[PDB]
Design a protein around this nucleic acid. Structure first.
Ligand SMILES: N[C@@H](CCC(=O)O)C(=O)O
Ligand SMILES: [Mg+2]
Length: 468
RNA sequence: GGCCCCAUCGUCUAGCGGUUAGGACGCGGCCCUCUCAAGGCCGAAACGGGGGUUCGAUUCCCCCUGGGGUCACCA
């Protein structure tokens, strides 16, 4: 059938490029009733960041993907972490040795650098070491690596399902290291051994791996295995069109979650990086995307990741996709983080409802509506000025307000409309200064709902401190 | 620099020989309105250049230019 996989390297924060590629793998697998695997590719102890693995696994789940096999969900072809499969690569590297498809090389990293400086790349000089001598030097413990013995001269065909066939000249393919001197495999060796053993049939990955594909075609040949299909997705880009990077863009999934972007929205945006619905619709579910996915609709240009459009979309989910109650639940962590509390569920829900069309990220909610949860709020200069100018009519309104028995948004509107009328002034002349009194801002939701929200007592108490 | 991939508004894109080249973000204007938003309407904004194929290129081919990727005992 169809088996796909995402194979993150635990060497930094959970990367958006990873979610992006994971998203297309997951969809292609489901669209085909196949399997979607997670394989942790921790073969480089130097760049290994302890804790990175858990973080990428949590971020994929957070984003909404599920995998069928992996480190924390089991599966028949585990382990799913390459550091625990060392003996396997070891074994396969040696089998290549016997088949005549690899050779041992003993140069120190220093000699290699020098070789590279003189000829710009390893010259395969170790191919000339007599096999029996190489074997003996190995038994004596002399440190070495095992390299791919590329067939020279020659030609190697790679087929990418989206771009067609590309024919590399073997002179462009290096005699790559397959097993390092510390006994760890390089990415090239492990990737082929594990995709095979875990049965992957469809390799969907970022374009940055395209030129390394001919090295993999050869390894599959060397082992006598059937190569899988290859689909290379365009790289996500920084605004300057270079591959998205930590210094020109936000590439950490943790940053996005911390900033209050909903996983559903981030996920919906990533689908738009290379894919589009037939009918041109832009807001759709994870499930709908799976059902409509087709490689015929994947475009190959490198998409600039636009934060502004992501925010637009996040605001769109907040106001049109999630329910009022869902938004209220998700806003809690940010209120907590801001050190604010809500009196009750009822209160929080109404507050979130009044602000729904005014925040594009969950983090923005506590910021723009701080006055709705604490007395410790800021009063802007423009608001303070509007307040001062309207103090006279506010003082004249106060008594009429402490008299209003029915504190409702309809009652209050009628009360204030009349007062402005009887005062021959425009409602705004009375609404704006009151808004400033109640919120310390001139940019808020409707005055009547703002006035109704806290109840007569709390409202006047605040109005009073302003008239003080 | 060698090799490889890519090419429609500033950005994400629709288009698979004939369209007033469409949508979305962002930008501007208007409407709504107690502020700010949200929403609605209108608007400005693209086929990189040169050859060919063809009755007819945004679309098929070549070159160029442009952009990107890749050349580690990193992934
Ligand atoms: N570990 C590789 C895996 C890429 C692949 O072959 O899918 C990475 O950087 O994601
Ligand atoms: Mg136009």
């Amino acid at each position: 059938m169809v088996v796909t996989r995402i194979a993150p390297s635990p060497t930094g924060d959970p990367h958006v490029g990873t979610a992006y590629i994971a998203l297309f793998n997951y969809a292609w697998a489901r669209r085909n009733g196949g399997r979607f695997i997670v394989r942790i590719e921790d073969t480089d102890r130097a760049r290994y960041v302890p804790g990175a693995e858990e973080r990428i696994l949590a971020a994929l789940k957070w984003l909404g993907l599920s995998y069928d096999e992996g480190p924390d969900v089991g599966g028949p072809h585990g382990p799913y972490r390459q550091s625990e499969r060392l003996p396997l690569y070891q074994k396969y590297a040696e089998e290549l040795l016997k088949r005549g498809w690899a050779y041992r090389a003993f140069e120190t990293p220093e000699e290699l650098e020098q070789i590279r400086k003189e000829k710009g790349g390893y010259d395969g000089r170790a191919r000339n070491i007599p096999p029996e001598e190489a074997e003996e030097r190995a038994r004596r413990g002399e440190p070495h690596v095992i390299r791919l013995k590329v067939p020279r001269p020659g030609t190697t065909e790679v087929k990418d399902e989206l771009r067609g066939v590309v024919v590399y000249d073997n002179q462009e393919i290096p005699d790559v290291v397959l097993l390092k001197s510390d006994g760890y495999p390089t990415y090239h060796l492990a990737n082929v051994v594990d995709d095979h053993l875990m049965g992957v049939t469809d390799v969907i990955r970022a374009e940055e791996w395209l030129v390394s594909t001919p090295i993999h075609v050869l390894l599959y040949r060397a082992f006598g295995w059937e190569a899988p299909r290859f689909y290379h997705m365009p790289l996500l880009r920084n605004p300057d069109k270079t591959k998205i990077s930590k210094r020109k863009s936000h590439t950490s999934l943790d940053w996005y979650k911390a900033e209050g972007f909903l996983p559903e929205a981030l996920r919906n945006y990533l689908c738009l990086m290379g894919f589009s619905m037939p009918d041109g619709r832009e807001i759709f579910t994870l499930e709908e995307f799976i059902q409509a996915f087709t490689w015929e609709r994947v475009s190959l240009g490198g998409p600039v990741f636009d934060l502004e459009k992501l925010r637009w979309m996040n605001g769109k989910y907040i106001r049109e996709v999630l329910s009022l109650e869902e938004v209220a639940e998700r806003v809690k962590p940010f209120l907590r983080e801001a050190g604010l509390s809500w009196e009750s569920e009822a209160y929080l829900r109404r507050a979130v409802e009044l602000m729904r069309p005014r925040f594009d990220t969950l983090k923005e909610f506590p910021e723009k509506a701080r006055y709705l949860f604490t007395e410790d709020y800021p009063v802007s200069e423009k608001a303070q000025r509007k307040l001062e100018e309207g103090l006279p009519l506010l003082k004249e309104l106060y008594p009429r307000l402490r008299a209003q028995e029915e504190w409702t948004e309809a009652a209050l509107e009628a009360l204030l409309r009349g007062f402005a009328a009887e005062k021959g002034v425009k409602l705004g002349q009375v609404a704006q200064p009151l808004r400033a009194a109640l919120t310390g801002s001139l940019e808020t939701p409707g005055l009547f709902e703002i006035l109704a929200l806290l109840g007569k007592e709390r409202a006047l108490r605040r109005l009073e401190r302003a008239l003080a």
